Design a protein around this ligand. Structure first.
Ligand SMILES: Nc1ncnc2c1ncn2[C@@H]1O[C@H](COP(=O)(O)OP(=O)(O)OC[C@H]2O[C@@H](O)[C@H](O)[C@@H]2O)[C@@H](O)[C@H]1F
Length: 172
């Protein structure tokens, strides 16, 4: 468990890899895989749908049970559900949907949830369907997270641009 391999280390606690989060989950067997969710735990495109599909939809049924009991999450909030076959647990975190003008400042709140967990395999919250700049998502992660976060970026082109943007931002 937690056998992460082939990451580039950006800070003492932030690692990045050009990889699909589901395939990493299957290789690594993490204690915590992070889902970039919405407040209803309705897993659409993006990481949520990729993770959900890999669980043969058990993730969405569990989420439906969670929501029926406790109601929707808040933006910036989270909940720990089961990791099924991918991880021990899945951290479901709701970043701001900047497409709907939700407060980008809640991206910081979202990443805070990471600090409740020694080690996580995570994507870049709000960076796809929710419309945030991926560079900005990385900046907020490295600035907010103090635990060990292994970031999976599947698109090689985004990953190269993200590394070169981080080198610039760290050196100023
Ligand atoms: N298989 C994969 N492995 C690794 N990285 C992947 C990936 N698939 C995508 N990414 C990238 O991960 C980041 C997060 O992007 P999104 O997955 O779209 O989450 P976001 O917070 O923007 O929106 C949440 C909403 O999306 C709905 O799925 C969810 O239910 C909610 O309504 C982006 O850089 C993607 F490019």
């Amino acid at each position: 468990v937690n056998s992460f391999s082939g990451y580039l280390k950006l800070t003492d606690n932030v690692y990045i890899k050009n990889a699909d989060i589901v395939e990493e989950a299957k290789k690594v067997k993490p204690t915590v895989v992070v889902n970039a969710a919405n407040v209803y735990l309705k897993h659409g495109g993006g990481v949520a749908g990729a993770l959900n599909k890999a669980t043969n939809n058990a993730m969405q049924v569990e989420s439906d049970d969670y929501i029926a009991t406790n109601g929707p999450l808040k933006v910036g909030g989270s909940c720990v559900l089961s990791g099924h076959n991918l991880a021990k647990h899945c951290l479901h975190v709701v970043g701001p949907n900047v497409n709907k003008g939700e407060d980008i400042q809640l991206l910081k709140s979202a990443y805070e949830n990471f600090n409740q967990h020694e080690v996580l395999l995570a994507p870049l919250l709000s960076a796809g369907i929710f419309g945030a700049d991926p560079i900005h998502s990385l900046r907020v992660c490295v600035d907010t997270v103090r635990t060990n976060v292994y970031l999976a970026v599947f698109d090689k082109n985004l990953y190269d641009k993200l590394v070169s943007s981080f080198l610039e931002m760290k050196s100023e």
